[PDB]
Amino acid sequence: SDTVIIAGGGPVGLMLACELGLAGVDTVVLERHDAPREPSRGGAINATVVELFTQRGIMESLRDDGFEFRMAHFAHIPLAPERVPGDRAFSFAVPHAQVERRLEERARSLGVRVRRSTEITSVRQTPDGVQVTTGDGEVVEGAYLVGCDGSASLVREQAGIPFPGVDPDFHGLWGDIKVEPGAPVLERIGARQYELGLCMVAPIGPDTVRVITGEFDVPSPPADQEVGFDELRAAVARIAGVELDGVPGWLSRWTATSRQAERYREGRILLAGDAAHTLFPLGGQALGTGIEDAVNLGWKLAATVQGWAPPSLLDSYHEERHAAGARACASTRAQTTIMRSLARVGELRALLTELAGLEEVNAYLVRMVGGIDGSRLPDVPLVTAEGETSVYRLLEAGRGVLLDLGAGLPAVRHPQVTYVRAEPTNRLDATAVLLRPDGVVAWRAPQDGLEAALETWFGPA
Amino acid sequence: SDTVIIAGGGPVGLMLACELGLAGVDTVVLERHDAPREPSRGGAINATVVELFTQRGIMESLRDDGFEFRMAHFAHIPLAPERVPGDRAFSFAVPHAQVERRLEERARSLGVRVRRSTEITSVRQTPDGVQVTTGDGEVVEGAYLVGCDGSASLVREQAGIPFPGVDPDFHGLWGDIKVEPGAPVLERIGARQYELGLCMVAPIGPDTVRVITGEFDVPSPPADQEVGFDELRAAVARIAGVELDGVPGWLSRWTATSRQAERYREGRILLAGDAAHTLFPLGGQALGTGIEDAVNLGWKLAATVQGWAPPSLLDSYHEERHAAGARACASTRAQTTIMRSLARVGELRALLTELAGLEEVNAYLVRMVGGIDGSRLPDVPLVTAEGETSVYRLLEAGRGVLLDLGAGLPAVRHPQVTYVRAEPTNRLDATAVLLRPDGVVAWRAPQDGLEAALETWFGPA
Ligand SMILES: Cc1cc2nc3c(=O)[nH]c(=O)nc-3n(C[C@H](O)[C@H](O)[C@H](O)COP(=O)(O)OP(=O)(O)OC[C@H]3O[C@@H](n4cnc5c(N)ncnc54)[C@H](O)[C@@H]3O)c2cc1C
Ligand SMILES: Cc1cc2nc3c(=O)[nH]c(=O)nc-3n(C[C@H](O)[C@H](O)[C@H](O)COP(=O)(O)OP(=O)(O)OC[C@H]3O[C@@H](n4cnc5c(N)ncnc54)[C@H](O)[C@@H]3O)c2cc1C
């Protein structure tokens, strides 16, 4: 079998399906729900996601679904992203349900089989492949299975993969409320750290606000106990110091679980997204880390089933993304550490605000919280023989790219790699780079080791 | 009489006494102990203390009692003080008992009456004076009383000044241990943050080490209970992961108390040092803040009893030093926030450690924990008509100084101020400054308001 089964059709699963579909791999996603769930948990995507979408032309399809914004924070300490030199993306306000719809439409348009209303009840693997049982008794078979089935992943559990980390005492609530004009909660728009905990209030409709509260190190009802509107109102009054009234729609709990799968791969079974790491939802790193799992994995998986992957390519998924996941965990825990009561962390918060005043600190934190590092390039304009283009347009094909910016290499000739010569530009501080299909820089002038890079990621030529 | 009574002859009381002695004020210090106590709680003084000692020639008297060192930390994150621009002081290693001996020696040489073996039992004031009673049944009378009587200050209590702040859960032990050669505790020399808490091991004699343990947010015996050696042995094995044995010379508890007097002045009664602020003992800010209390207060009190103090000059002691105390409080609390277990603060500690690699963060933190800001100058070499000097040498007489570095003002004529003309130097970023007797800049070119500054701090010309 040459088929990849994706367990779960959330944002990470759907992104992975898009990657595999672009690569031309036979792919099936099994998703329990008949549609993306509403209301959306998330209302924004960070620089990591924006860039990874752009290098596949996915942001254009989201153009009219939301808006660019250029704000960021570290544990609700305001940062200034537009002061940061370079050309890295900023953030984008859009409900995650809409992101999911665009991703699903893209995946289907690429030939991926999407099976909604299909519950996985059982997961097995043999030396010859992968087998999943659905709630209708059907067995679906493939070469590989990827658990993108969220925090509580059935795939992770059935694979025997431990999920270590912590479940802190935390009282977290959220919901959409229809409010009247003049509603006191409208005086608390934004995400802020108050004396006792966090409260975020955001307009999501002409008469509607999303309200989120979170208080650390305090008792909380169990996560599947019903949330009465009076509980949310009491939290808002206690934390935000304002009276909430209105007509509640959605009301639910959320947790401060911070856990990561001990390994991202077990034979023919792999993990991505929330199944692989469940982190505190801050600044878009939670989804961002999952989306970048998907992009890291897609092309490696494809190369593997198509027969041209170097022996160790698929193992580099766990190696790179478990490290990246641990760094995301570290960043988000560093943040939640100072989201305790101000009686306990107020002074350190004020110190950090002061430090964030220093240009290098602001740049450091904006990049960290956006999930941005020097492993990928910015989407910079380029001029080639075929005219004007840019770095990320070269990556839309989903193929490796040797981009020569004046280093003047003899044209690299590898069946998996596209050689592109472009005029020099000051906006990239390398005269040549080798880009993996996920956009990651595998080599750059003037480093030695170009052939080893080529062979490591694409095989010999 | 017109006598200043100082309650307490610790480092802060004795420094205050030296300041008053320099200014020619009749002064008595009442101190419970027959001699500075051993063992010393502290073994180093920070940049603030070194500078304030230097501007009175006191470091000279200490030159053979210890040694300069150039290390610093923020909650045991190592810093690099020598990378910092300026001519600001570093640290000095010396037991505090010896500092006390030198300060008392200086105070006596200036004619201060130092009465040891004296228990103060009650303190009172009348419109015309202060009255303090001793355990032997005598009354000491004066014009002003200053409480330098430590953390448990009787003077603070009897003046009815509240001591708000916090007393975190904290298990702190310390003592001096005579150990056998090859003792495993010598494998842990230094002040370090471990998994569970902090431990400092410091050689203090050929076969004697000081050992200090501290663990936050765990149960502990009350601070007045006795320490058995077994308790310290367990703490060291638990925290530092090493076996301690030997013969203890002294064992006691210490707390993470962080409190500050609501006001530093109540009529003719004032507070300084630990009586004014009890902070976490870390990096030298605990003593440093007190020493600068003493230097701030001395000349102002002198001006008050000599009749040349403007009406609100003594009040400025509370305004400045309370503010400075609050900042020290905020600083040290910031630090203790990340001295919890690494299971709770490890990621934030690692992040901060990375940020401290940025030059401006390193500078910010070194200056902060050294108590150093822009309110005083460095001790820079100067060239005057009378030959070579330095900034602090001009401050040893304890008078205000109008230091003209090429601004070429007409000679300032003020009975409390010395006008000094020096050649330009690149090591001071002003062409002229007005220095208060505590070394603090009251005015600098090209600011307006030289006359106003003169009148504010030194009265009418
Ligand atoms: C309250 C809250 C607010 C948040 N806000 C943000 C934000 O603003 N920005 C941000 O970036 N992130 C945010 N996050 C985090 C973000 O929602 C997740 O990181 C993201 O949804 C992870 O995507 P995923 O596809 O891995 O998992 P999911 O979105 O959970 O998708 C997993 C899918 O698998 C399906 N599934 C599960 N089990 C089975 C089964 N047995 N058979 C078939 N299908 C199955 C589920 O139906 C689901 O569709 C927030 C999270 C919470 C809780
Ligand atoms: C374990 C420990 C380690 C420390 N380490 C450091 C360090 O490394 N660096 C640092 O800078 N700081 C350190 N400190 C803090 C430092 O010791 C204090 O900040 C400093 O001693 C304050 O000086 P002070 O003169 O205000 O009070 P004290 O030093 O407490 O002096 C007060 C004096 O008043 C006398 N007194 C009190 N009541 C009466 C009374 N009724 N009658 C007569 N006399 C009285 C006492 O005998 C005492 O001599 C440490 C503290 C502790 C507990």
XYZ file of C-alpha atoms in Angstrom, chain B residues 204-443:
240
model
C 35.577 31.186 55.423
C 38.634 29.642 57.050
C 41.346 27.001 56.434
C 38.897 24.244 57.374
C 35.641 26.148 57.853
C 32.807 26.799 55.350
C 29.702 28.912 55.537
C 26.659 26.940 54.393
C 23.350 28.574 53.478
C 20.246 26.726 52.246
C 16.925 28.129 51.116
C 13.784 26.467 49.753
C 10.611 28.425 48.928
C 6.970 27.411 49.346
C 7.542 24.420 51.656
C 6.645 24.035 55.345
C 9.302 25.108 57.854
C 9.697 25.468 61.629
C 9.006 28.993 62.948
C 12.017 31.345 62.730
C 12.644 31.432 66.479
C 12.924 27.644 66.929
C 16.372 26.086 67.363
C 18.185 24.343 64.529
C 19.579 20.864 65.043
C 22.513 19.926 62.779
C 20.466 17.075 61.263
C 18.128 19.642 59.722
C 20.973 21.399 57.891
C 22.466 18.073 56.795
C 19.113 17.011 55.306
C 18.642 20.368 53.561
C 22.072 20.232 51.943
C 21.613 16.643 50.752
C 18.129 17.472 49.419
C 18.995 20.717 47.636
C 22.693 20.520 46.697
C 22.865 16.722 46.336
C 25.913 16.299 48.509
C 26.614 15.077 52.056
C 27.457 17.623 54.707
C 29.200 16.632 57.902
C 31.494 18.297 60.417
C 31.197 20.354 63.583
C 28.845 23.327 63.457
C 29.872 26.494 65.169
C 26.563 28.261 64.898
C 23.189 27.346 63.394
C 20.238 29.591 62.699
C 17.187 30.150 60.580
C 16.507 32.986 58.197
C 13.370 34.063 56.419
C 12.258 35.430 53.088
C 10.570 38.393 54.791
C 10.065 41.304 52.391
C 8.620 44.314 54.200
C 9.038 48.106 54.300
C 8.156 50.773 56.866
C 5.092 52.759 55.736
C 6.936 55.981 56.598
C 10.588 56.657 57.443
C 9.792 59.582 59.758
C 7.419 60.224 62.664
C 8.204 63.654 64.103
C 11.653 63.556 65.699
C 11.921 59.807 65.140
C 13.264 58.327 61.905
C 14.100 54.855 60.583
C 17.024 53.465 58.532
C 18.337 50.105 57.343
C 16.576 46.822 58.187
C 14.270 48.709 60.579
C 13.104 50.610 57.483
C 13.152 47.674 55.084
C 13.720 43.981 55.546
C 14.446 42.420 52.183
C 15.679 39.071 50.922
C 19.484 38.923 51.518
C 20.817 38.564 47.981
C 23.551 40.212 45.893
C 24.147 42.915 48.438
C 21.006 45.041 48.013
C 19.883 44.225 51.563
C 22.805 46.014 53.216
C 23.371 48.400 50.290
C 19.911 49.955 50.583
C 20.534 50.560 54.307
C 23.976 52.102 53.863
C 22.510 54.514 51.302
C 19.686 55.303 53.796
C 22.404 56.329 56.235
C 24.256 58.506 53.739
C 21.033 60.140 52.508
C 19.955 60.956 56.057
C 23.150 62.054 57.804
C 23.851 65.376 56.118
C 20.157 66.300 56.085
C 19.878 65.676 59.824
C 23.075 67.647 60.329
C 21.636 70.548 58.337
C 18.502 70.317 60.456
C 20.310 70.585 63.815
C 22.804 73.193 62.541
C 19.951 75.408 61.373
C 20.659 75.693 57.636
C 18.176 73.072 56.447
C 15.315 74.372 54.306
C 11.893 73.518 55.813
C 11.268 70.402 53.697
C 14.805 69.004 53.554
C 14.397 66.430 56.354
C 11.094 65.294 54.795
C 12.949 64.543 51.555
C 14.657 61.698 53.447
C 11.366 59.833 53.536
C 10.454 60.836 49.985
C 13.661 59.654 48.365
C 14.609 56.673 50.524
C 11.102 55.205 50.753
C 10.969 55.345 46.956
C 14.399 53.794 46.734
C 13.433 51.163 49.304
C 10.383 50.251 47.294
C 12.525 49.817 44.203
C 14.926 47.567 46.102
C 11.944 45.639 47.367
C 10.585 45.236 43.862
C 13.978 44.174 42.588
C 14.582 41.496 45.189
C 11.059 40.108 44.931
C 11.557 39.841 41.151
C 14.545 37.700 41.941
C 12.918 35.471 44.556
C 10.061 34.882 42.166
C 12.438 32.701 40.147
C 14.064 31.047 43.116
C 11.194 28.570 43.363
C 11.808 24.993 42.155
C 12.938 24.544 38.550
C 9.825 22.415 38.029
C 7.955 25.689 38.373
C 10.361 28.351 37.090
C 13.065 26.512 35.134
C 11.889 27.635 31.691
C 11.628 31.302 32.696
C 15.071 31.115 34.329
C 16.508 29.693 31.074
C 14.803 32.407 29.036
C 16.147 35.151 31.327
C 19.585 33.570 31.156
C 19.441 33.865 27.385
C 18.279 37.492 27.599
C 21.145 38.327 29.970
C 23.451 37.473 27.047
C 22.247 40.660 25.360
C 24.612 43.522 26.283
C 21.957 46.006 27.449
C 20.234 43.384 29.601
C 23.536 42.432 31.213
C 24.157 46.113 31.943
C 20.646 46.705 33.276
C 20.873 43.709 35.635
C 24.443 44.400 36.855
C 23.541 48.019 37.667
C 20.283 46.963 39.387
C 21.721 44.285 41.662
C 24.689 46.569 42.406
C 22.176 49.263 43.432
C 23.708 51.551 40.834
C 21.768 54.197 38.942
C 22.464 57.535 37.345
C 21.869 59.523 40.539
C 25.555 59.573 41.507
C 28.765 59.860 39.500
C 31.615 57.379 39.132
C 34.874 58.051 40.956
C 36.712 59.545 37.929
C 40.203 61.100 38.008
C 40.163 64.906 37.905
C 42.721 67.620 37.233
C 42.353 70.830 39.209
C 44.537 73.880 39.797
C 45.685 72.098 42.962
C 46.821 69.005 41.080
C 45.279 65.592 40.618
C 42.191 64.445 42.498
C 39.097 62.369 41.792
C 35.359 62.974 42.107
C 34.924 61.108 45.404
C 37.975 62.711 46.993
C 36.134 66.019 46.640
C 33.241 64.460 48.585
C 35.285 63.324 51.608
C 34.749 66.608 53.491
C 31.022 65.874 53.363
C 30.020 69.198 51.809
C 28.129 69.938 48.614
C 30.360 70.336 45.564
C 29.783 72.440 42.450
C 32.072 70.582 40.083
C 32.817 72.653 36.971
C 34.222 70.499 34.152
C 34.539 73.216 31.524
C 31.082 74.756 31.612
C 32.962 77.665 33.158
C 30.245 79.121 35.358
C 31.070 82.099 37.538
C 32.310 80.756 40.873
C 29.345 79.629 42.937
C 29.341 81.297 46.339
C 27.399 79.310 48.904
C 28.434 78.699 52.544
C 27.552 74.979 52.293
C 29.047 74.347 48.836
C 32.592 73.988 47.533
C 33.229 75.295 44.025
C 35.785 73.172 42.187
C 37.041 73.773 38.660
C 38.442 70.794 36.772
C 39.709 70.115 33.292
C 37.251 68.445 30.869
C 37.019 64.639 30.971
C 35.359 62.177 28.583
C 34.508 59.961 31.546
C 31.773 62.272 32.795
C 28.830 63.170 30.556
C 28.394 66.729 31.802
C 30.317 70.004 31.685
C 29.245 70.848 35.257
C 27.365 69.165 38.143
C 26.048 70.114 41.576
C 26.730 67.250 43.998
C 24.888 66.943 47.283
C 26.965 65.827 50.289
C 25.545 62.298 49.810
C 27.064 62.345 46.291
C 23.694 62.697 44.550
C 23.440 64.934 41.469
C 21.082 67.816 42.185
C 21.773 69.631 38.894
